[PDB]
Amino acid sequence: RSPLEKASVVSKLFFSWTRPILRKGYRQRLELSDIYQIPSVDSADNLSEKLEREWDRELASKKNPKLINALRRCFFWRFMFYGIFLYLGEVTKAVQPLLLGRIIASSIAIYLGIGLCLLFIVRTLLLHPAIFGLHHIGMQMRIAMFSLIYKKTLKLSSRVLDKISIGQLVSLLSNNLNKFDEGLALAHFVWIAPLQVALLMGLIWELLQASAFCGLGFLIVLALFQAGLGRMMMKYRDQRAGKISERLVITSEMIENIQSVKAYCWEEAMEKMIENLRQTELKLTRKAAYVRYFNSSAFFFSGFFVVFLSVLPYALIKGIILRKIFTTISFCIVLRMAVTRQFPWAVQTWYDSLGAINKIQDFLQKQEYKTLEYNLTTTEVVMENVTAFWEGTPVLKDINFKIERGQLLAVAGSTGAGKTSLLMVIMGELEPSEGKIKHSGRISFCSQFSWIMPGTIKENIIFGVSYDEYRYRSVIKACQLEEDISKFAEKDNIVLGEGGITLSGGQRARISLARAVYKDADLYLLDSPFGYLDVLTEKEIFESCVCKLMANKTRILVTSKMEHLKKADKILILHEGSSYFYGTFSELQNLQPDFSSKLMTTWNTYLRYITVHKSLIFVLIWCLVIFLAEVAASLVVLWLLGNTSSYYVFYIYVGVADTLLAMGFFRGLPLVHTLITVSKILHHKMLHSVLQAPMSTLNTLKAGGILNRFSKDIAILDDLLPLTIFDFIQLLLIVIGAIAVVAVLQPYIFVATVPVIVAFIMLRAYFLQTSQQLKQLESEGRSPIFTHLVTSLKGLWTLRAFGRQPYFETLFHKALNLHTANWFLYLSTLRWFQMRIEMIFVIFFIAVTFISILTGEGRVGIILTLAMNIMSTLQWAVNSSIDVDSLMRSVSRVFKFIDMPTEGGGQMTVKDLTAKYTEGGNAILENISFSISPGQRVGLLGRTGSGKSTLLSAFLRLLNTEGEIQIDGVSWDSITLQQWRKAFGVIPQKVFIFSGTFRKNLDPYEQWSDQEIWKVADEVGLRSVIEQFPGKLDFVLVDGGCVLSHGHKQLMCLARSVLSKAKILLLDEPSAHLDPVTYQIIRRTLKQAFADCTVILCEHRIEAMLECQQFLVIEENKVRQYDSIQKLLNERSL
Ligand SMILES: Cc1ccc(NC(=O)C2(c3ccc4c(c3)OC(F)(F)O4)CC2)nc1-c1cccc(C(=O)O)c1
């Protein structure tokens, strides 16, 4: 079934079976169903059970459950089977320069060249398949662990689950979703790196005769210093972290109230604030970047000293042959690479991996839910001596009841009086330590908060069972659902989405009652499912199935109805956490008559980026001119010396490629600084261009999809991309310079190197298309896992009460396998690309070596000493190219935002008002006309409730609107919008208060006098409500102005409107928002001190706006008018 079960060994080895998708992924787009099936052994269901067997074996064998030592018997052995291969692959790398250091002798060298080419072939065979298998073991680990974690998630008691932090689960799972899988190509370097040195410091001793340690000590100094830079980096990034949240909260707030900023004309204030916050964040990030450059440059200036200090003493004491320079250097590369990068990566990998395993081990131990011994045999359900604590706080006062197998009881009380907790106990999700609460235990549930799964109506109303036509017909016609079935689009199999928004409250309640009464259980706990259906609909359902079809059997509802509780064979009414009274229906309805009566990626992007900043041109030109002149200088000195000991000890500089062309401290820093300044410029201009997009465009961009263009891309553009571009330039420069040096020594390397560089570039272009497409596919394949996780958590109570855990286990396993296919395929194709790269390098080396040998002393030494160890930096250059082309996507999406357009007396007149949300949608008005009168209101009533938001907002020119407005002699044409939208003054239903001090949250432009502000505050009815604040007035209104209440915030907004001398006050929702005392305050303020602003009070109920003088009546698509109540409540309203 898979593509791997049919393949030759050679094809499984050189990754030939991945050819057809590459044969496909080049020419055309991939269709999601083109992804080959998973190999059988990687099926989640075939691994989770295996891992669980060993896990609970570790649990039941000892009382120190080291999960890692339950893994050590699952995968460990194949782990060794790949570790030994990797060890051999690295010993080959270490020992090859010895077979290099014999052919400098010159006959007897060609044979060693053949052997060395075979050494390259051995390395390129033993590395890549072993690394791929290791990554495969990593993927198996991740899948098995996720399956166990999920399967466990549906076993937690509720006492601990409602106490876990909602973000803990998502962070825990997603943390090791990509990292941990690749965190096994670097595990064996905990005992590879040591064996390499205890090998190397043998051979080098055999060469130096006294001086081994003198270089290892330098490497220890260097590595310790470089790691010490780690904390001096992390401290800066820590200090920046919370500061990023401080910058981000105001951006989120602004994004979430954009139409307020547009109406108040505050664009410049927000821009200035965002700048003044970002300044110091850039300060810290720039410091961090300089430190990180020092870090990455220490590794590049190692390669010279690591050999100069190891060569200096023995050279001093005795003259050294030249063979012991070109040879030792080729060891010095490996040793450096095996104590500075390979070791700390292994150490960090084990830290992080064992930390994550510690976390998961500490997870699986948590308190485990148990399903009670039910459905064995039982008569009438009995709940005797029931005492339960909502956290010793008694939600139940030792209650008891016997409910007959067929009878009917009804609970009632205050909302959440613990009767819900009493059911969640009788439902077995809360454990009361008192008494005996038990039943037959075959119970169905219908919770107050319905959940909607993914699938058709038959699915959410079956939950994994057959469909009986009589049962479905009775339910639908009974649950007010035969209409709800038929009325739908396809009417029987609507392919539903998630969230439940596709239906209303009534449809959702019908669906929940259906899922409840679907199958027959010895009890039906319907926790007030009749609370979202209409009263007549409630009576319909009660007469239909609630009190008709499931009443002939046992049932225990929880309802607060005055009519329903009458007909139940028992009643239990509770207050103050205890039953006020209860008993039989007649006895309860009589035992308290008073109480009973009371209760009821293009080169456009590259060039654009590189030329956003006229200093980047200069930095690149300088960096390249210095590189070119340095190549020329080293080449001329090489020729001069090629055609006192310092003469021949010069060779140690050119003889190492790295330090020749490594970015000096006077050239590598300004590039890193310039990139960060480019990030600032781009961020500022994106902000400027998202504060002026026309509002009929922003509407398309859903609100969650703009903040992520700030908190994600700009973070990348600050931290990641500058370093990656720096490393790419450094590595490409090194490679090209070394290849130039190799070329000039004899001019046959050039004409062979051209059809090798062409091959590299062609292969890279042939691969990246498929790699990027498969990356994207994996990206959208990751989402349904978390969707299913959310759906599982939300409906856990009902899920467990049904008893349908395995079905969802299988569904989650399906989603897992569906992601696993894409991941496995991407991994395999990446490794194929690496193999082809290294093989092409190997043929290039065959060419260089044989051409050089078959045609001096320093010539051969330098040629070979570069063409041997350039491969590592070449592979880094290729991987860095991949990473930079990946990271440029953020720049591309940023430029997407960069390209949006800018938006554009008291008496007045209005005509021809065309308005809609989109360009040409539903006409908000049809040539609406009116007169705006002097010094008196114009009430907006009539069809108030058909939407006054359209005309109200379009009066501020903040919708897809155009037409005719003429205010006091001026029109909507001449004056600038930023000076026209300020004449009108909004009084929004949701007042905006920036997270800052009062002087800035009320007068953000800061053009007022503090005494003027004090006067405008006191006279506007806020002095009292502002006297109770910290300090005097500088209170930082943190967390969205939580302290103030609707009345105080409304008065503040009113003062902010009174500030700029607004000549129109379109106040909306007077009584809905204001409290009663606050309503009196607002009325007495606006009528008295806002006396002569031509307000338009637009409230739905006519009783709120009947007071105003005129009435510009409201009516859909035609704004009729009755100038006075002499016809208003007689013609428009009647
Ligand atoms: C005693 C022993 C035997 C074998 C192993 N190897 C493993 O099990 C495997 C593994 C697991 C997680 C990893 C990892 C490698 O590499 C990583 F990616 F970094 O994370 C299957 C290879 N490990 C140990 C061991 C080590 C350290 C501590 C303990 C302990 O009992 O505390 C036990």
UniProtKB/Swiss-Prot annotation:
Changing residue 948 to A: Decreases glutathione uptake. The modification Phosphoserine is found at residue 504. The chain crosses the membrane at residues 76-96, 112-135, 185-205, 212-232, 288-308, 329-347, 616-636, 653-673, 725-745, 748-768, 830-850, 862-882. Changing residue 511 to V: In CBAVD; uncertain significance. Residues 79-354, 616-886 form the ABC transmembrane type-1 domain. Changing residue 766 to C: In CBAVD; uncertain significance. The keyword Lipoprotein applies. A lipid is attached at residues 479, 1093 (S-palmitoyl cysteine). Keywords: ATP-binding, Cell membrane, Chloride, Chloride channel, Disease variant, Endoplasmic reticulum, Endosome, Glycoprotein, Ion channel, Ion transport, Isomerase, Isopeptide bond, Lipoprotein, Membrane, Nucleotide-binding, Nucleus, Palmitate, Phosphoprotein, Repeat, Transmembrane, Transmembrane helix, Transport, Ubl conjugation. Changing residue 885 to G: Decreases channel activity, no visible effect on protein maturation. PANTHER family: ATP-BINDING CASSETTE SUB-FAMILY C, CYSTIC FIBROSIS TRANSMEMBRANE CONDUCTANCE REGULATOR. Belongs to the ABC transporter superfamily. ABCC family. CFTR transporter (TC 3.A.1.202) subfamily. Residues 392-600, 908-1134 form the ABC transporter domain. N-glycosylated. Phosphorylated; cAMP treatment promotes phosphorylation and activates the channel. Dephosphorylation decreases the ATPase activity (in vitro). Phosphorylation at PKA sites activates the channel. Phosphorylation at PKC sites enhances the response to phosphorylation by PKA. Phosphorylated by AMPK; this inhibits channel activity. It catalyses: ATP + H2O + closed Cl(-) channel = ADP + phosphate + open Cl(-) channel; chloride(in) = chloride(out); hydrogencarbonate(in) = hydrogencarbonate(out); ATP + H2O = ADP + phosphate + H(+). Changing residue 884 to E: In CBAVD; uncertain significance. Changing residue 517 to I: In CBAVD and CF; uncertain significance; found in cis of the IVS8 TG11-T5 allele, which affects exon 9 splicing; no effect on protein maturation, trafficking to the cell membrane, nor on channel activity. It is linked to Cystic fibrosis: A common generalized disorder of the exocrine glands which impairs clearance of secretions in a variety of organs. It is characterized by the triad of chronic bronchopulmonary disease (with recurrent respiratory infections), pancreatic insufficiency (which leads to malabsorption and growth retardation) and elevated sweat electrolytes. It is the most common genetic disease in Caucasians, with a prevalence of about 1 in 2'000 live births. Inheritance is autosomal recessive. Congenital bilateral absence of the vas deferens: An autosomal recessive disease characterized by vas deferens aplasia resulting in azoospermia and male infertility. CBAVD may occur in isolation or as a manifestation of cystic fibrosis. Changing residue 646 to L: In CF; uncertain significance. One of its GO terms (molecular function) is chloride transmembrane transporter activity. Changing residue 574 to S: In CF; impaired maturation of glycan chains. It comes from Homo sapiens. This is Cystic fibrosis transmembrane conductance regulator. NCBIfam families: CFTR_protein. Its main location: membrane. Changing residue 577 to D: In CBAVD; decreased channel activity; has no effect on glycan maturation. Residues 1-75, 136-184, 233-287, 674-724, 769-829, 883-1134 are cytoplasmic.
